[PDB]
Amino acid sequence: GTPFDTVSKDELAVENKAMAGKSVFERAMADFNGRYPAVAALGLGPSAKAERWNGRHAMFGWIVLLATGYAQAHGLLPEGGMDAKEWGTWVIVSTTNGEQVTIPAARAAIAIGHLHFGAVGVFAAYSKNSVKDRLLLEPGEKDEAPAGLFPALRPGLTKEAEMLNGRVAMLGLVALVAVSAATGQDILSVIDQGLGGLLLK
Amino acid sequence: MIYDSQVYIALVIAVVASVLAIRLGATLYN
Amino acid sequence: VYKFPKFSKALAEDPSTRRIWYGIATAHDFESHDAMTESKLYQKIFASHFGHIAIIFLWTAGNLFHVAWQGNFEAWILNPLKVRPIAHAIWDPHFGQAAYKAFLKTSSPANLALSGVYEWWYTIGMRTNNDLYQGSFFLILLSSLLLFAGWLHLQPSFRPSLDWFKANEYRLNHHLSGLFGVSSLAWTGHLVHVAIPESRGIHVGWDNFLTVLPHPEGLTPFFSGNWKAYAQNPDTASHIFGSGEGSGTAILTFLGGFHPQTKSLWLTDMAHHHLAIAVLFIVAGHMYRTNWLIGHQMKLILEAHRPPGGRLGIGHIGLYETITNSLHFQLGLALAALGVATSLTAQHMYALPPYAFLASNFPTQAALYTHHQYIAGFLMVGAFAHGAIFFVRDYDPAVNTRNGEKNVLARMLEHKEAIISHLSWVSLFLGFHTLGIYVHNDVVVAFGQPEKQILVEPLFAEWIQAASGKTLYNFDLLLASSNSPASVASSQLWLPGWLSAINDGKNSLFLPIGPGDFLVHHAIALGLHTTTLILVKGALDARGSKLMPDKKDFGYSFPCDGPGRGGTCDISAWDAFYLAMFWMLNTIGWVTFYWHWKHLTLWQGNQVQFNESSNYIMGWLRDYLWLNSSPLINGYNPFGMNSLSVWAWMFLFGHLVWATGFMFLISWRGYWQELIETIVWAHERTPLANLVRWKDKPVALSIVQARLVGLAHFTIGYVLTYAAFVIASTIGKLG
Amino acid sequence: MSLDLLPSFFVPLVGLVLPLFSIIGLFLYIEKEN
Amino acid sequence: SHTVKIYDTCIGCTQCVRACPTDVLEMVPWDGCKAGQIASAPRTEDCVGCKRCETACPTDFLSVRVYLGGETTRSLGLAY
Amino acid sequence: AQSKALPFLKAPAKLDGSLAGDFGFDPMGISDQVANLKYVRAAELKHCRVAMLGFLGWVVQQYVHLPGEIYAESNPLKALTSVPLLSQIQIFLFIGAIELATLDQTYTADKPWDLGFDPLNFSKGKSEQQMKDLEVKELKNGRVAMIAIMGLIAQTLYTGVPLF
Amino acid sequence: ESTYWEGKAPPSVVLGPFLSKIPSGVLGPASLVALIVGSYCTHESNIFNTLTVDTIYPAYVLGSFLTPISWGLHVAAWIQKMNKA
Ligand code: CLA
Ligand code: CLA
Ligand code: CLA
Ligand code: CLA
Ligand code: CLA
Ligand SMILES: CC(/C=C/C=C(C)/C=C/[C@@]12O[C@]1(C)C[C@@H](O)CC2(C)C)=C\C=C\C=C(C)\C=C\C=C(C)\C=C\[C@@]12O[C@]1(C)C[C@@H](O)CC2(C)C
Ligand SMILES: CC(/C=C/C=C(C)/C=C/[C@@]12O[C@]1(C)C[C@@H](O)CC2(C)C)=C\C=C\C=C(C)\C=C\C=C(C)\C=C\[C@@]12O[C@]1(C)C[C@@H](O)CC2(C)C
Ligand SMILES: CC(/C=C/C=C(C)/C=C/[C@@]12O[C@]1(C)C[C@@H](O)CC2(C)C)=C\C=C\C=C(C)\C=C\C=C(C)\C=C\[C@@]12O[C@]1(C)C[C@@H](O)CC2(C)C
Ligand SMILES: CC1=C(/C=C/C(C)=C/C=C/C(C)=C/C=C/C=C(C)/C=C/C=C(C)/C=C/C2=C(C)CCCC2(C)C)C(C)(C)CCC1
Ligand code: SF4
């Protein structure tokens, strides 16, 4: 308060000159890697490996969303709800007045398809020695170098092309979710509006 | 009855409180 | 096997599984950690306090959110005496159709709320599931604040020093005045502004609170000094809570007693109470000296307090440095105060229910009383354990001694034998004679001659009841008399409300008592005295005894001193805590058994069943346990199940955990090390499993760890089985 | 997605997945070396 | 490993040394008692903590004291 | 004595010389608890800048509005609720993006208020005395604005008149 | 300083640097007057006249506060008298 020091002189912050320059992206990456090792060494978090994998998944999922819209529009995507007598009480969603509303069968089928794809992913994860691109970084391996604001304009089946397309697809998913939340329509409704009407036709 | 927006933003705020918790947890050291 | 107990290198070098077990149990003993200083100790404790308060606020926010989302708060508002509050919904995949149907409440299976949060939140002026959501949002924000503060005060430039942590006068001034008084002032502000009109049908939310006057005159009487205006026109005797019918305009009154409709304390009474408490604590928060030359230096106060004739030695001269430099002395004091406070909460929230319609919520009444009494026992045992720890590791005889003469604390170790001997005498006296009278009643009633029972009328306690106004024992003493100065003095302030409540057979305010109450109170006194004997003996004998005159050199918790010189089992001070936990559990069990049986007889109406059968042990065993256990055990039978099925399962679960504790307590080590060695040989000498080998050598649990594990099983089973019994019995007997 | 699907989405998630990953992390941490 | 200390109350009666099951204690020359010998603990790495040493001590409150400390495969008596 | 603002009191130890705007004004001795004056100066300058922007926005919203209807509310406190949540959340996200990097910056640096913001280079070529004079001008104007913006908020909450 | 004492009476420093300089011949009669005034105020607010919302009388209340005080004043008077003051 006055007759003593609240903070000792031996415990004072020192400005980190090691981050001079080092644009916010480099600064954030360095801070994450130094603060959280053993998850940064694995390639997790704000890393080029994680960004590449998430971009691949975002592109594949744009494909999956288009397929789901097509299936819903074209009379596929089974109708009704799951059978509680067949699949237990865990599929029951609510009981309004004497009727049990269950999980829609369409949701169950879509979950099964997503389970197929996620299982493929889990196999590839526990198949590191036989896959071309691993999920995590080996001890020693170093994370590919960030592409930057604009990756190199190298057309074709190149690392830069896949990188750019993954970033674009992830941004598209972010924008799609933002539009759906702000305006209030369904995700497929937003995709239908953003395709003119050629999806849910 | 609370809306989906009410629950969703409470979940989002809960996530922010979670990131603040691990920062305190990691700052209290391994 | 080289980085889990980061705080202890001695444990990290243990090649056995004991390292993992001891790593958990020593994580919070910061004073014993490697490379340890006092500054780091206080800073880590400070950050842990912040995280703990954040956890508490998150827990409260979760309760609020789950009541708002899956509860029936809004429906319960319109019919509080028939609608059963819902805690949260249930989603368990293991349910059959029958379990789903039985637990089904409204739209989904759900659990009834026994915490009484519905009544508490309704009383403080909540009427919507959006009011609860706002509270949950605000509490999560507060938790984020506290987590940020905890992180911040570990940063280099924001870590407080030892002087700031040991600044007693500043912390006392602020804690008392700011915390207690200002929080009471803010609570009075909320009580008036929101709660008082909401009980009268006027909604005061976060929109119309700057424009809705809590009183029609509006702060004019306060500044003008006409403070009586805030008491004029109180709520009438026909006021319907939450509605404007029969309401008043007063905000601070003396009425005494209970609301005629909700059977709870007047909201205007509690606002006035908190305003008075706020003023008193704000005044008392200016006592100690700070940067402005006025106040008290508590070192001088302690040093100057030596009786002149001389019977406390040199007084309290060395107590200031003793308490300031020890965190276990302060922790013990705080735990003792908290235990007394929560005992007070338990004893007053049933006699003087403060929340609307909480008196008619029998299961929640029983649950609240049992919960708070168990917490009280835990806190008291913790206070005594930390006193023992202070004796072992923080007490310095040199500080508490001046020129041979010893101060008030050091003299407690001189007549320690006298203290322990007299505690033992009181315990033996009470146990011998309470058991003698109980067994005399048992034998006499069993032989078919109940008239030969020894039944002592609790005249001393009935004298107190008459002194507070109960005209039931024909004492005509202080407030049972209309001519005594005690009655004429308050005949115009709070007696009409107080007398109307104390002299009512439907209340729990000063329940009528008889010989059974006398005997059970003596049993309670015996339990308290024996628990105190164990804890005080462990605390005083912590630094040494005749069997171990160097016990302080072995620490607070060690297994033993060996097999010779007689033996040496359970000789440490930790073992005294371990033994006293059983006695605390037994004493709290007696207290809660007495409370629950008395209130079950009161609610059912057969108070004659308690007054007659409570004088002998078989009466308890047959009419409380055996009688009220019937609804609980039939929570599921070979024919079906009820919503009480979970309580029967918890009953059996508690019995199982209790007996596993019996395992860990009766069977000691040495018998489990050789068996583990046989298992190790079997694993090492079997094909197809030799490919898998342990990294930590499997060993039997240590003696102290085994005692802790057995105590934990005993306590968890005890608590679970009694909670299941009390809740299920109340629910199944009283509808 | 209705609000009543949240229990079936979260209870399995928490009560099974969180134990698995927590066990993985805790076992890895307590079995580390220096 | 456990810690074993010897105190000058030692009378050199050798009962501690001949009771140690792991050869931790030994008798060394001394001039503080009639026997001219005092117990020593030069091999505490083999100390198991059984405290047989101080069960055979005739002095009033012991002259050999065993303070249990960090554990080792030798001090834990592990044949495996 | 040493305080210029309170010519009778003596200022606290940490109020001296440098850190422009130092008029010895700390009667309660708050500076005695803080390890340095860096963080409190950073907070004061952030408040000064936010209050300047708030006063300017108050007046402009009183007189000038965006073409859209959602921005047609004249009362700033009423516009706080009339404006859609999308605009306010966008503003908050922009502020938080600016705030996280400066959060890393403030708690450790020697000049936490120096965010490197000078797009027009009004400080390039200025001498030390001129720079200190500019800092004094900023601090003065900010303190006056803080008082003014709090007064505007109070008068709008108490009378409903957002200005004058 | 050194408020610790072992003689017949504590040193006058325990009274604070306002009562340490009051003569005992002033504190004594003042203590008796304060005790009498406080007792009368207590007996006039209550006992003799029953209390009521309309009759609180800050003089009697403030007065009654002189009874607890009186205790301190005469304790200080004795301390001053024994310390040759
Ligand atoms: C400490 C408070 C607390 C507690 C004990 C519970 C307890 C429960 N919640 Mg819950 N909840 C809380 C706060 C809490 N809630 C808050 C604040 C929110 C708002 C975000 C929610 C939102 C919520 C939803 C949406 C659902 C539950 C559900 C459930 C049930 C199943 C568990 C689950 O799926 O959790 C999931 C919980 C969350 C996703 C929110 C996080 C919970 C808080 C914020 C974390 C508290 C951490 C705690 C202090 C210590 C953590 C220890 C950890 C390190 C091991 C269970 C009864 C489910 C249910 O009702 O099933 C029938 C369900 O679907 N909760
Ligand atoms: C006005 C200023 C102020 C305020 C509000 C606080 C408030 C707090 N400080 Mg704090 N502190 C202050 C100034 C202040 N401090 C100063 C100036 C210093 C430096 C000298 C400190 C140093 C300090 C330390 C070192 C620590 C705290 C801690 C705490 C927290 C205690 C835990 C808690 O939540 O209790 C909440 C308690 C209540 C709301 C009230 C309790 C009600 C009681 C139990 C009822 C009693 C009623 C009655 C007496 C019962 C008996 C019946 C009767 C008949 C006898 C609390 C938030 C601790 C903490 O947790 O840190 C995060 C801690 O470790 N403070
Ligand atoms: C706010 C109160 C408070 C605080 C700050 C402390 C703080 C401390 N105590 Mg303490 N204590 C308290 C209350 C408190 N205690 C109470 C109330 C008791 C009486 C029960 C004790 C009894 C006690 C003893 C006997 C000892 C301590 C010790 C310690 C120190 C180390 C703690 C440690 O290692 O934790 C270790 C934590 C654990 C081992 C976790 C135990 C968790 C238990 C078993 C419950 C978990 C089971 C859970 C209910 C599961 C439910 C089952 C389900 C099926 C329903 C530390 C300074 C120790 C010490 O050395 O002090 C110097 C010590 O020997 N305390
Ligand atoms: C109810 C209390 C209780 C229980 C459950 C046990 C259980 C056991 N005792 Mg015993 N014991 C007890 C009280 C009890 N004891 C007491 C009071 C004493 C004091 C004298 C002893 C003294 C004693 C000795 C001296 C010995 C035993 C032995 C045994 C074991 C026999 C082998 C066996 O059946 O393992 C199977 C385990 C069970 C039947 C327990 C229930 C397991 C459930 C039903 C199945 C599995 C549940 C599943 C894993 C849960 C997973 C979910 C969870 C993670 C959440 C077994 C663990 C012997 C031993 O070491 O084992 C050979 C032995 O030598 N006990
Ligand atoms: C919060 C805790 C929790 C939760 C949510 C569950 C949930 C469940 N338990 Mg369970 N359990 C728990 C704790 C829990 N358990 C504990 C602690 C114990 C020990 C006391 C048990 C002991 C137990 C037993 C003994 C059994 C269950 C069963 C079940 C299932 C209910 C039966 C049914 O209709 O499903 C029917 C189930 C299916 C149709 C298939 C479910 C298979 C798994 C769970 C699906 C997981 C999908 C996963 C994402 C796949 C990952 C990708 C992979 C392909 C690579 C359900 C999945 C029953 C069961 O189904 O056994 C498998 C059963 O027999 N539990
Ligand atoms: C926008 C975003 C991140 C934005 C981050 C920002 C601004 C960070 C800013 C900062 O760092 C700086 C600059 C400096 C730091 O000091 C401070 C901060 C402020 C922290 C991430 C989006 C991230 C978006 C991601 C990762 C999207 C992933 C989508 C996937 C994987 C696709 C999944 C699907 O395909 C399936 C699986 C199945 C299909 O049915 C469904 C779908 C959904 C289509
Ligand atoms: C890349 C992508 C999809 C890629 C799909 C691929 C590769 C599929 C490959 C396949 O092998 C699979 C997987 C499976 C096979 O069976 C099918 C094929 C086809 C063989 C989608 C991107 C989708 C990208 C989308 C939707 C982008 C949306 C962007 C928006 C809205 C931008 C808005 C802004 O630009 C404005 C308007 C103004 C700016 O100032 C601000 C912002 C906000 C940046
Ligand atoms: C806005 C302001 C200054 C803004 C300056 C800016 C943005 C400069 C930015 C830059 O320089 C940097 C940073 C870096 C350069 O490289 C780039 C640029 C971009 C050039 C000062 C306001 C300063 C504003 C001040 C001092 C306001 C004082 C207000 C008063 C006294 C009001 C009083 C009243 O409102 C009440 C109280 C009640 C009412 O009813 C009555 C009245 C009388 C109206
Ligand atoms: C071990 C130890 C410790 C601890 C201790 C403890 C834990 C204690 C407890 C204690 C306690 C727990 C106590 C209690 C107390 C109580 C009291 C003291 C009470 C009182 C009361 C009164 C006095 C009342 C009165 C009255 C009446 C009766 C009527 C009404 C009114 C009036 C108020 C008047 C410590 C740490 C410290 C230190 C070390 C040692
Ligand atoms: S413990 Fe006692 S006996 Fe066993 S070895 Fe060590 S010293 Fe010799």
Which protein residue's CA is at the shortest distance from atom 61 of ligand 1? D7
Chains that touch A (3 or more CB pairs under 8 A): C, D, F
Beta strand segments in C36-95, E: 86-89
Question: Where on the phi/psi map is residue B12: left (φ > 0), alpha (ψ -120 to 50), or beta?
Answer: alpha
Q: Cβ of C647: how many Cβ atoms within 10 Å?
A: 22
Q: DSSP string covering B1-30, please?
A: ---HHHHHHHHHHHHHHHHHHHHHHHHT--
Which atom of ligand 2 lies nearest, measured to the CA of C46? 64
Question: CB–CB of C547/C568 below 8 Å?
Answer: yes
Q: What SS3 string covers A16-47? A: CHHHCCCCHHHHHHHHHHHHCCCCCCCCCCCC
Question: Where on the phi/psi map is residue C605: left (φ > 0), alpha (ψ -120 to 50), or beta?
Answer: left
Residue type present at position C64: L
Q: What angle do CA F123, F128, F132 make, to 5 degrees?
A: 80
Q: Chain C: give the shortest CA distance to residue F130, in Å.
A: 32
Reported as type and span, the H/E element at residue C655 is helix C645-666
Q: Which residue has the tokens 């879509």?
A: A110
Which atom of ligand 6 lies nearest, measured to the CA of A68? 40
Nearest to A81 by CA among C102, D4, B8: D4
Round to whole Å and give the CA distance between E14 and E12. 5
Which atom of ligand 10 lies nearest, measured to the CA of E47? 6
Q: DSSP string covering chain F, please?
A: ---SSSTTS---TT--SSSSS-----TT-GGGTSS-SHHHHHHHHHHHHHHHHHHHHHHHHHH---SSSTT---SHHHHHHHS-HHHHHHHHHHHHHHHHHHHHHHTT-S-TT-----TT-SSTT--HHHHHHHHHHHHHHHHHHHHHHHHHHHHHHHHS-S--
**Backbone phi and psi for residue C636, each to the nearest 5 degrees, phi listed first:** -155, 130
- Order of all β-strands in the sheet with C108-112: C86-89, C108-112, C104-105
Round to whole Å and give the CA distance between C600 and C605. 8
Nearest to F145 by CA among F46, F40, F75: F46
Q: Which residues from G are below 8 Å from C491, CB to CB?
A: 50
Does the distance separating the beta carbons of A93 and D8 come in below 8 Å? yes
Q: What SS3 string covers C488-553? A: HHHCCCCHHHHHHHHCCCCCCCCCCCCHHHHHHHHHHHHHHHHHHHHHHHHHHHHHCCCCCCCHHH
User: Quick one: which ligand is closest to E50's CA?
Assistant: 10
Q: What are the residues whose beta carbons fall under 8 Å from the beta carbon of C241, sequence distance 6 or more?
A: C199, C259, C261, C262, C356, C357
Torsion of CA F99, F102, F104, F105, to 10 degrees: -170
Please give the structure tokens belonging to residue C107: 């739209």
Does the distance separating the beta carbons of C558 and E55 come in below 8 Å? no
Number of H helices, E strands in chain A: 6, 2
Residue type present at position C98: A
Using CA of residue C336, residue C337, residue C338, residue C341, what is the dihedral sign?
Answer: positive
Q: Which residue has the tokens 């002194």?
A: C467
- The strand pair at C640-641 and C405-406 is best described as unpaired
Q: Which residues from D are below 8 Å from C20, CB to CB?
A: 30
For helices C459-467 and C515-540, the axis angle rounded to 10 degrees is 100
Round to whole Å and give the CA distance between C193 and C209. 7
Q: What is the Å distance from ligand 8's center to F134 Cα?
A: 14
Q: Which residues from C are below 8 Å from F107, CB to CB?
A: 155, 157
Q: CB contact, 8 Å: D13 with chain B?
A: no
Round to whole Å and give the CA distance between A55 and F54. 41
Q: What are the residues whose beta carbons fall under 8 Å from the beta carbon of D26, sequence distance 6 or more?
A: none
Does the distance separating the beta carbons of C108 and A95 come in below 8 Å? yes
Q: CB contact, 8 Å: B15 with chain C?
A: no
Q: What are the residues whose beta carbons fall under 8 Å from the beta carbon of C468, sequence distance 6 or more?
A: C478, C479, C498, C502, C510
Residue type present at position G32: L
Which atom of ligand 8 lies nearest, measured to the CA of F161? 40
Nearest to E76 by CA among E1, E20, E15, E19: E1
Q: Cβ of C659: how many Cβ atoms within 10 Å?
A: 12
Q: Cβ of D12: how many Cβ atoms within 10 Å?
A: 13
Question: CB–CB of D10/C88 below 8 Å?
Answer: no
Does the distance separating the beta carbons of A93 and D5 come in below 8 Å? yes
Please give the structure tokens belonging to residue C733: 């007997």
Q: Tell me which of C92, C153, C163 to substitute to probe the interface with A (most A C-beta atoms closer than 10 Å).
A: C163
Note whether F touches C: 3 CB pairs or more under 8 A: yes
Q: Give resolution, Å, one decimal.
A: 3.2
Q: Which residue has the tokens 């691109």?
A: A133
Please give the structure tokens belonging to residue C38: 């006092």
Reported as type and span, the H/E element at residue C711 is helix C703-733
Q: What is the Å distance from ligand 5's center to C94 Cα?
A: 9
Question: CB–CB of E53/E26 below 8 Å?
Answer: no
The SS3 of residue A102 is strand
Q: Cβ of B7: how many Cβ atoms within 10 Å?
A: 15
Round to whole Å and give the CA distance between D18 and E5. 51
Please give the structure tokens belonging to residue C600: 């079950």
Pocket of ligand 8 from Cβ distances under 6 Å: F 52, 55-56, 117-120, 122, 141, 144-145, 148, 151-152, 155, 163-164
Nearest to C233 by CA among C251, C219, C220: C251
b vs e for F68-107, b when ≥16 Cβ sit within 10 Å of the residue's Cβ? eeeeebebbeebeeebeeeeeeeeeeeeeeeeeeeeebbb
- The strand pair at E26-29 and E37-40 is best described as antiparallel
Round to whole Å and give the CA distance between E41 and C198. 79
Q: Which residues from C are below 8 Å from E68, CB to CB?
A: 558
